[PDB]
Amino acid sequence: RKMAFPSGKVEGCMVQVTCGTTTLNGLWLDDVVYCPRHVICTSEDMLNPNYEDLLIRKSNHNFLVQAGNVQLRVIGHSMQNCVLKLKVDTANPKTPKYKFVRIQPGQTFSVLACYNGSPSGVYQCAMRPNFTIKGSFLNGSCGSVGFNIDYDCVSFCYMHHMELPTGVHAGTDLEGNFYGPFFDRQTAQAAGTDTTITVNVLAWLYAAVINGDRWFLNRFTTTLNDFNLVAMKYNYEPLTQDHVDILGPLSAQTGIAVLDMCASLKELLQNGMNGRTILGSALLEDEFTPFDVVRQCS
Amino acid sequence: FRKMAFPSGKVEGCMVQVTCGTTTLNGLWLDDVVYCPRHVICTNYEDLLIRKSNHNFLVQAGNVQLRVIGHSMQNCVLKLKVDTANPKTPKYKFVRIQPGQTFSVLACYNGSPSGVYQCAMRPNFTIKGSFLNGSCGSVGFNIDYDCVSFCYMHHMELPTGVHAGTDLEGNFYGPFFDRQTAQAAGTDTTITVNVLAWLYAAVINGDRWFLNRFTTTLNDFNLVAMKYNYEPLTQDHVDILGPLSAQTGIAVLDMCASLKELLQNGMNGRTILGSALLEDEFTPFDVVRQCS
Numbered sequence: 349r350k351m352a353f354p355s356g357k358v359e360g361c362m363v364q365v366t367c368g369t370t371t372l373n374g375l376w377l378d379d380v381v382y383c384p385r386h387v388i389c390t391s392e393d394m395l396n397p398n399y400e401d402l403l404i405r406k407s408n409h410n411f412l413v414q415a416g417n418v419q420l421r422v423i424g425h426s427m428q429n430c431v432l433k434l435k436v437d438t439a440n441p442k443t444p445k446y447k448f449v450r451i452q453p454g455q456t457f458s459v460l461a462c463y464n465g466s467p468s469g470v471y472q473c474a475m476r477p478n479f480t481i482k483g484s485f486l487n488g489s490c491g492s493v494g495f496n497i498d499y500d501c502v503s504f505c506y507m508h509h510m511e512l513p514t515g516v517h518a519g520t521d522l523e524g525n526f527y528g529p530f531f532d533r534q535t536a537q538a539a540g541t542d543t544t545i546t547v548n549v550l551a552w553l554y555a556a557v558i559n560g561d562r563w564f565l566n567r568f569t570t571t572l573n574d575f576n577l578v579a580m581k582y583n584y585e586p587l588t589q590d591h592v593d594i595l596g597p598l599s600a601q602t603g604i605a606v607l608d609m610c611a612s613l614k615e616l617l618q619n620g621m622n623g624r625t626i627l628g629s630a631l632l633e634d635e636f637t638p639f640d641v642v643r644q645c646s
Numbered sequence: 647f648r649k650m651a652f653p654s655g656k657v658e659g660c661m662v663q664v665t666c667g668t669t670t671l672n673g674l675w676l677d678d679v680v681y682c683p684r685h686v687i688c689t690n691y692e693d694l695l696i697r698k699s700n701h702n703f704l705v706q707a708g709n710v711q712l713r714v715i716g717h718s719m720q721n722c723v724l725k726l727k728v729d730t731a732n733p734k735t736p737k738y739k740f741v742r743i744q745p746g747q748t749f750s751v752l753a754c755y756n757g758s759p760s761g762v763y764q765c766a767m768r769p770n771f772t773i774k775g776s777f778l779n780g781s782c783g784s785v786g787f788n789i790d791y792d793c794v795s796f797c798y799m800h801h802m803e804l805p806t807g808v809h810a811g812t813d814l815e816g817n818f819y820g821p822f823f824d825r826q827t828a829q830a831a832g833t834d835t836t837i838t839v840n841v842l843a844w845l846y847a848a849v850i851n852g853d854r855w856f857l858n859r860f861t862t863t864l865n866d867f868n869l870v871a872m873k874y875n876y877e878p879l880t881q882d883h884v885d886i887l888g889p890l891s892a893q894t895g896i897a898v899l900d901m902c903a904s905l906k907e908l909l910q911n912g913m914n915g916r917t918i919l920g921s922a923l924l925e926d927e928f929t930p931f932d933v934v935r936q937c938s
């Protein structure tokens with residue numbers, strides 16, 4: 349299954365931020381609230397906002413931060429890239445142990461979809477190689493965050509900003525830097541051509557081997573360079589050393605070398621599946637990470 | 647449009663670990679009662695329970711131990727009365743869901759929540775979940791205006807890999823029983839009303855390739871549906887699909903003709919919302935709640 353992390357530690361951090369008639373979601377950690385900076389924007393200055401100039405015309409008392417219907421008094425404000433940081437006079441007592449991290453394409457995370465500071469649902473997302481996610485977001489969702497949880501430490505990696513004309517979604521890390529070549533303005537922007545997440549397909553093949561489905565295992569190997577050149581001819585991502593390293597645990601568990609599995613996938617790309625299934629599916633799955641695979645058997 | 651689970655925080659605060667002897671599983675702590683699968687007492691259930699004392703039960707809520715001051719059994723569920731009320735108890739109800747309805751599962755191990763995902767109660771009263779050793783006592787639920795409706799407590803994995811469990815009154819969904827015994831489910835069928843709901847979701851999200859100019863009657867559609875092991879579509883289902891048909895301007899029986907064509911022709915390697923298979927685990931409410 350696509351399995352999200354339990355969302356409770358994040359739910360306790362969700363607030364709403366209103367500037368004018370514009371309300372979006374914010375993230376309340378200790379005595380700072382993080383939210384998309386375009387909350388300060390007006391309907392007439394959003395085609396290309398001068399955020400620096402627009403923020404100079406703003407004061408602490410222009411910002412309405414609410415935990416539910418309880419107002420949190422704002423005592424400071426600053427901008428860091430595309431996020432606004434509102435210092436408030438109350439430390440959130442539900443603040444979990446947390447980190448801010450920037451994830452890489454192929455990595456998965458849970459999204460807590462929120463409207464008016466109230467969580468509405470949770471689901472797993474994979475960052476595509478073109479730095480979009482296939483999410484489920486409506487108006488009012490901006491400021492919803494994505495996260496992973498490791499040993500009760502919440503690593504926030506995504507804050508929601510945009511829906512591209514193709515219906516996929518784009519956002520920033522929690523330091524306000526967009527994933528991919530996008531901008532927080534009211535314009536139609538296009539992602540790069542997407543590719544298949546090779547390291548995740550490999551993890552999926554390891555998962556099939558773990559469960560006894562191993563017809564696709566062959567008697568060949570490859571170099572990583574040779575595989576990377578063939579992979580790109582099939583719209584598959586090239587592998588990095590970090591991808592090879594994160595496949596280590598599954599490689600050891602099955603006893604199938606990473607480069608051996610690469611040679612197995614290489615056959616699958618050049619010969620097709622031939623009406624055979626892998627884990628009961630005609631299509632190769634590329635949104636399970638190596639960690640997701642080990643977790644679903646741990 | 648994605649499979650979306652309810653936020654799990656209100657349930658996480660209720661999960662505890664229940665231990666009897668060498669057996670441990672998860673329990674649900676609401677006010678001053680912990681609910682868990684009764685086979686936690688096993689190494690004839692009424693005979694085995696009468697032989698247990700309160701002190702045979704260890705209940706851990708995080709790192710604090712709750713003292714069991716009483717115990718009873720309601721069908722396949724054990725009810726352990728504890729000396730502490732759970733301050734995190736949400737407003738809650740116990741409900742028995744209908745086949746074809748969906749819920750969120752909070753998979754837990756050793757009293758610690760691990761993952762959350764959406765399941766449907768299959769027509770054969772199994773669920774297609776993701777549960778491992780130690781997942782017993784994990785619960786399924788829906789949330790409506792901060793009220794948690796608990797509908798499922800997890801008990802077993804069938805040889806086929808699907809899952810079986812009880813409502814919170816301890817009564818199994820399906821013809822299953824809580825013994826260490828291989829059990830087969832009845833023949834499963836596809837939840838027709840949900841497939842139609844999902845095709846409507848695809849149209850609301852700008853996918854229209856499966857639509858056709860044809861229409862069908864309700865009975866003619868049901869003849870083909872039954873031939874393909876789909877559940878019958880009732881007029882109540884047609885009524886429930888009203889909002890989605892109103893939103894999209896596609897009559898329910900028009901969408902039925904689309905589904906009939908899909909069933910007789912196949913998808914021909916094309917895709918709907920990324921799936922090569924017809925999806926039947928979104929209810930009409932699930933589609934409305936998410937698309938709007």
Ligand SMILES: COc1cccc2[nH]c(C(=O)N[C@@H](CC(C)C)C(=O)N[C@@H](C[C@@H]3CCNC3=O)C(=O)COP(=O)(O)O)cc12
Pocket residue numbers: 370371372386394485486487488489490491509510511512513517531532533534535536537
């Ligand atoms: C002509 O221009 C366009 C053309 C074609 C495609 C386009 N797409 C966007 C866009 O995405 N614009 C951002 C705002 C900018 C400043 C980043 C936005 O609309 N974000 C939503 C979430 C979105 C809304 C629906 N589904 C989501 O994911 C917020 O949540 C904040 O807006 P709200 O105040 O809540 O309505 C503009 C645009």
Ligand SMILES: COc1cccc2[nH]c(C(=O)N[C@@H](CC(C)C)C(=O)N[C@@H](C[C@@H]3CCNC3=O)C(=O)COP(=O)(O)O)cc12
Pocket residue numbers: 669670671685777778779780781782783801802803804805809823824825826827828829
């Ligand atoms: C001959 O026997 C069999 C043959 C063929 C298939 C079979 N299937 C089962 C079964 O499922 N048996 C229940 C216990 C009975 C008494 C209800 C069980 O094992 N439930 C798990 C969750 C399970 C564990 C793996 N995935 C899950 O969903 C608990 O959580 C409690 O067990 P644990 O103490 O946690 O290990 C027995 C059996």
